[PDB]
Symmetry: D2
């Protein structure tokens, strides 16, 4: 685990449009904080509607028929993405450090996981660019018919603060591989890594206007994207509330394409025949990863009665082993929550668990004199009507419940408006296949949890979102299909 042997210096703080750095139209700036210390790191240019309009015009122009980005070989779009991955690999120490400092994110994970994921995802996407293909189709009648899987056009992409870099790359990788242009709005909490990447987009040689990055707030810059009359598509990861607003704003304006990923209340089902240590470990990391701030957090763990008490005991032992503190310091194993709102939400929900009669096994309160820290918290004997069993907490708060009827537990697992993911732990082939088939969730892990890769599509059932990202299947959502049908004198098979 190498580190930056020199203190981080913040350089890139401006709006990125047509490969140059812009002041906000208003002249306004907003502060950016270190969640572990509550101290301002810097000021960043505050994008708003006016700045979004500049970025959209730039993106529109870069998408015009005859432009460099429309006319270059697909393989060259791919080359540019591979180059960007190489640049991020070059600046890995710097990026992992900035990510950890701005995002409250453990540095070892930032370096070994987030940065690795960004690099691998970009390289995966680079490979698709010249492998996006349409069809030739044996239509009835004397016609030649083919399809073009064109890029859609200008894609507005709004990303959250929990995985700033990974989410940036998850959005831009596919969009660019397919030939789109993008207007990106990073989370107000975490604009800095996106702006560094923008410098590397310029360095790699992407044509101007192909990627534009507009830091700013949700109701301002975000809303301007969702309601813009010349944005063809909007992609978003974040809260359900905002997802609704985005879909509504898209409907009112220009009926732009919308894809959403909106978190979850993801269940695990642990059968009595399960490898118990393996289930405890994966379910543990499954809920606690990055201070509980994962859309896929395994926030309801149902365990067969006969192994329930043992499951709970071992889970508690594991949760009691964390070291809280600054995510930069080696050996520290839990960083802060991102901000006050999240902090407040986690505490309120923890209090509801105590009130509504859940058994507190450990944690249950805040930690320290600075930083938005929350003790890792475990509740057992949780019941389905409790707030901590229904609401996404997005904090280090684990719920453990028992069942003895498998039919009943699948119904309980499914009894939510969410549906992002689930986990099944068993040694039995038939149970693994039939349970995974019955769960209304986008990804089901069997005898593991939290395994996400560029090669697999990822997305929600129900209110956890719509559409899929990554894999072969995800690329479909960044193309617009055109059918071309040509009259011919006579066809032959």
């Amino acid at each position: 685990l190498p580190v930056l042997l020199t203190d981080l210096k913040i350089q890139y703080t401006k709006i990125f449009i047509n490969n140059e750095w812009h002041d906000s139209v208003s002249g306004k700036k907003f502060p950016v904080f270190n969640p572990a210390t509550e101290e301002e790191l810097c000021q960043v240019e505050e994008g708003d509607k006016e700045d979004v309009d500049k970025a959209v015009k730039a993106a529109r122009q870069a998408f015009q028929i005859g432009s460099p980005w429309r006319t270059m070989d697909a393989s060259e779009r791919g080359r540019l993405l591979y180059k960007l991955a190489d640049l991020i690999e070059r600046d890995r120490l710097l990026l992992a450090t900035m990510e950890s400092m701005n995002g409250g994110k453990l540095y070892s994970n930032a370096y070994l996981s987030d940065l690795a994921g960004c690099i691998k995802t970009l390289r995966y996407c680079a490979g698709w660019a010249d492998k996006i293909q349409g069809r030739t189709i044996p239509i009835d009648g004397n016609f030649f018919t083919y399809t073009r899987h064109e890029p859609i056009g200008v894609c507005g992409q709004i990303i959250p603060w929990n995985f700033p870099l990974v989410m940036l790359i998850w959005k831009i990788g596919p969009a660019l591989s397919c030939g789109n242009t993008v207007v990106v709005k990073p989370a107000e909490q975490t604009p800095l890594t996106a702006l560094h990447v923008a410098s590397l987009i310029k360095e790699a040689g992407f044509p101007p206007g192909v990627v534009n990055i507009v830091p700013g707030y949700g109701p301002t810059a975000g809303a301007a994207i969702s309601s813009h009359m010349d944005i063809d598509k909007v992609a978003f990861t974040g809260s359900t509330e905002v997802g609704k607003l985005i879909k509504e704003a898209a409907g009112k304006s220009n009926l732009k394409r919308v894809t959403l990923e909106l978190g979850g209340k993801s269940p695990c089902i642990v059968l009595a025949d399960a490898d118990l240590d393996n289930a405890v470990e994966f379910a543990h990391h499954g809920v606690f990863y990055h201070q509980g701030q994962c859309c896929i957090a395994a926030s309801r763990i149902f365990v067969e009665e006969s192994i329930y008490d043992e499951f709970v005991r071992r889970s508690v032992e594991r949760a009691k082993k964390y070291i809280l503190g600054n995510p930069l310091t080696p050996g520290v194993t839990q960083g802060p929550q991102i901000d006050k709102e999240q902090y407040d939400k986690i505490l309120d929900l923890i209090e509801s668990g105590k009130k509504e009669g859940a058994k507190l096994e450990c944690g249950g309160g805040p930690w320290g004199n600075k930083g938005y820290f929350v003790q890792p918290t475990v509740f057992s004997n949780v019941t389905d009507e409790m707030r901590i069993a229904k609401e996404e907490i997005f904090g280090p708060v684990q719920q453990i419940m028992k069942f003895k009827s498998l039919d009943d537990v699948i119904k309980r697992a499914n009894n939510t408006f969410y549906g992002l993911s689930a986990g099944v732990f068993t040694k039995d082939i038939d149970k693994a296949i039939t349970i995974s088939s019955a769960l209304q969730a986008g990804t089901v892990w069997v005898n593991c949890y939290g395994v996400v890769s560029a090669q697999c599509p990822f997305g929600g059932f129900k209110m956890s979102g719509n559409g899929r990202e990554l894999g072969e299947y995800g690329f479909h959502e960044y193309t617009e299909v055109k059918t071309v049908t040509v009259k011919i004198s006579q066809k032959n098979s």
Copy 2:
């Protein structure tokens, strides 16, 4: 062209839920009219929110894990669809007659085209059922990963009055082939053919609740579908206004998947080297088909100056050759518009063309003492800011314009919030390919127009809709992708 040698008798007038005929919960009924005579044909049970709730419950139950429709072989879903096609072929005379009588639709077209399209589309969809496949994916790490392309669940499907049968089958064919269950709301104007088909769904042996048909109005039954908390997806063909309302209602409620097809203002570009007679014929039929009531109507025809006057002359000669009257009577070549609202809209727009200075070549007024008839109408020297050049008329009203700059005409062709289709007429390979690539439209025809087939995906760019129907690509929109990732001791390629 065979005919029913016995008078049509209306039998099926009720709400279809769980394969039985239901009265409306309210007890209310609404009238159904023959647009050619303005006479009531019958009364039909009026579905509203309460009836939609009954259909959704039925559809939900038919979709449950372990149900007949979830557990039957995919090939058997396909068999059921093939059987339904055979039944519609059996009742072709009856259906074509009912379609023509209720829809104001020329009987020869109803029989030879609409009914043929329904049959062929169903058979096409039947073939996909056991050919819907997921993937196995060489994910990083020691895992086995596969995907399931599951049906989504309960699909709400709202269809228009212009092609009642074709649109019914365009919706239910793919949805059912993929294993979904459906709640269908036919247009208030044209419920009758859908209800006959429902009798044939029962006869074919589809499990109850797999298809439910709820006749009724837009703001009542339609709105209940779009806002329902247990409908997983809504599909819609109709007006832009309603498309917006549907997307908004889906966002406010349960973030259900939405696909829309919303008509157009589709352009043709006729180059000087074009086969002129061929371009005139296809552009003519392209705008005039079914009294102009096609989403893809070729409602802006741009012709190179040197052949413009000849194009206009020949177009006028062709338009002056129609025989208006009852769509049932042989040799009649133009039926009525569907209803008063459409009628009023076409007349108002025709008047705006005269006012704003378009040259009237023929038609321009109503026809007859009964029926919503409009003279076939041609305007030349139309300019881009005129109402008849911007608004979808949905009537027998042709606009012809000239150009001499090809760069300019492509920009004019593209200068619309619509984008459903377009036509290009030229003998030159390079022009055909480059022009079709540059047009922002879902289907581009070359040296033809209006060629739609079950084998090709169909849908809009921009505000003409989102998603694609039919072809291989259309089937994707009726599946929900689940990734299953299984921990293994060691993988091997």
Copy 3:
């Protein structure tokens, strides 16, 4: 289980070329026998080189650019195949009876399985016809590139006597769906069902020359196919010896495409945790089905030592329960072998098992005064160097062996030049996945055996064959891919 309530009368005994019945050029005929009685059923026209030349010319002409079969809609090729399935369904009683009488095949299986498989396979193939698609490809440079998945042309198809109808349809279904024309040579033992199907091909309305059926012998009619200078592809199921000759003859002549399926020595691995009754049943039916005359026969069954004796006991009990006799008589559960050569081969191999020291548990000799009957025979304590462990027997002869090292048994399972299929019986997810991945076989069944369907590709690893039949993947082998690359002035994504 319905039966023909009228005695079978043989009608179709001639060579089928251009949809008419032909005498052999030589005037020669050959006899056809009932294997259960050794009595001649009829005489059939003997095709030889001269007749093959007539069929190839007919097939070539039907494949010419501009012909009905090249110009008809793909959906119409599909319609024709669906019609043929409907006709075979109509004549199911007759076909199942003829199959059983000519092939020595149990009538209940013939009716319920073989005929069902033919019908289902044809319907599956019908569905692909208009779903065979090429690609459009974003090649480097200013070009438009697309591919056509054309039919190959004249396909020579040689099929065996064990599943005459199923194999006929397995060959012609895909070939025709893809638009090829075919020259079929049924086994000399079993020409009759193929000739009836030919009458139904004529009745369904296939254009003449699209299917031609040339009964005759291997070294005569078969060899003429394999060496023909105007046959584009040859497909074959049968013996390894002949497979070699076919590949060699194809290399010497016109380098025609070759696909082979050549039987096996397929292993099962039964782990100690397996559902034992389920493993015994499937392994039993897996080797004994159709008198052992299946390419996929489970002819080496390795059982973990701790359950080996119990496995063997239960296997023996099951084998001792058969009733031998005429395949037409209800309750009869084992018919004859096909002919004297097979009969002789099975007996010789059974004798080698006794000689080389295998433990005879039951059977071991012939049965009856007429018909090529062999007692169902079980050997335990078989070792890998014995003839019955290495050679495909193609008779009712089961080999059971023990193991205790899993690494070792996989190596033993794989230690063969064959590789058609295998079976794995265990309750453990990891073992099921890792073992199936390690076995060098085309199809691996888990906790079942002998499950073959039109939707899955089927074919061998190693010397069990090359290429795959059926599924999506099998269709690729009946197309020839053409790339078309068109110079354009400027491309756009």
Copy 4:
């Protein structure tokens, strides 16, 4: 056009097995010559059967279940290929020089085209590695069925001398991306660039035994590959004669999979409406490229009578403009033929053209005192029965013919046992589509020629070969499909 600013020094002259350099078992070496000077460049270790056996054992071991190459992530196979491309880019000057010196290949083409093609092809193949996917399949009955697209195993790959590097990469890129191991036999004429690449395979970090390179002769090392009992597949580009021998040897031994590309007699059809200068240029380069030593050489050019004389005149003017000499010297535009056999064959065929009455427009004899040089030669009024119209010349010899019947010229174009490629020159859409559809050739170029890219599949119809290389479609030929079918208690769609 940069050059090596230092003289080339030959380093790598040994057999490459398990990532180390081996002497031949016999101790024998063979000489390697510069075709431009007829001087020996070096000696290279001569591989024979014994050495092939060592390489196959190494390849077999590297392919074993549990090996590094079988267990590494697919994305890592891709990474290794990307690294190799980067290494070849690093050594581009050296490789382009060695290629030109050993292969008689113009240095500017070697550098700008061959080396670029190698790099781009490797990068294309790298991108597929983790995008090779099987299927999940909705089989009839209560089963879970999926497929694995496994690597085949040990692939023997025999390549020719005309494009040593490009062909090496065309073979190993796909084979390795798919996870195979390879035993490569470069042409005896041109082993040197392959051995340098082998050093870069070692440097990139490929596991030992994954690639093995065995220089040597055809009937010795080549024959040992084709007849080997433990090689799973053989791929070959070269002469028809050898293709036959390979297919036969594969049939006699172990029925290994075979794919062949075998050159052609590729036709162009130039219509009267064609852009004439464009057709002349592409047809010219189409036959003359790399001294006529391209499988796709446009060796029959049919021109409509009305433009035939002009076509011939302009073609002659272009052919008379070459500068012969050393392929290393700037401004030199034609190098030597590869060796004496080719040289002799070209001269003999040129003499047959004079004898049989073809009109000699220019060239017709040898050139210089050393090097296998042949004057660029044009024949007009060539007729279909002449040797130069039927036999692949593989020299700088152009045939031009006239036609006036389009039906007739397509039949003439098709009247060959070859079918690798063809060209069509016209401005008319319908002709371009219908002619290209009618030509029995693997690639058809329209208004261009010789446009080959990694993204498109490439291969012959008829005796020009079997199978396809590159594109998505080519990758299929380097996988072996396994179906896995698992019994489950109950399936759900």
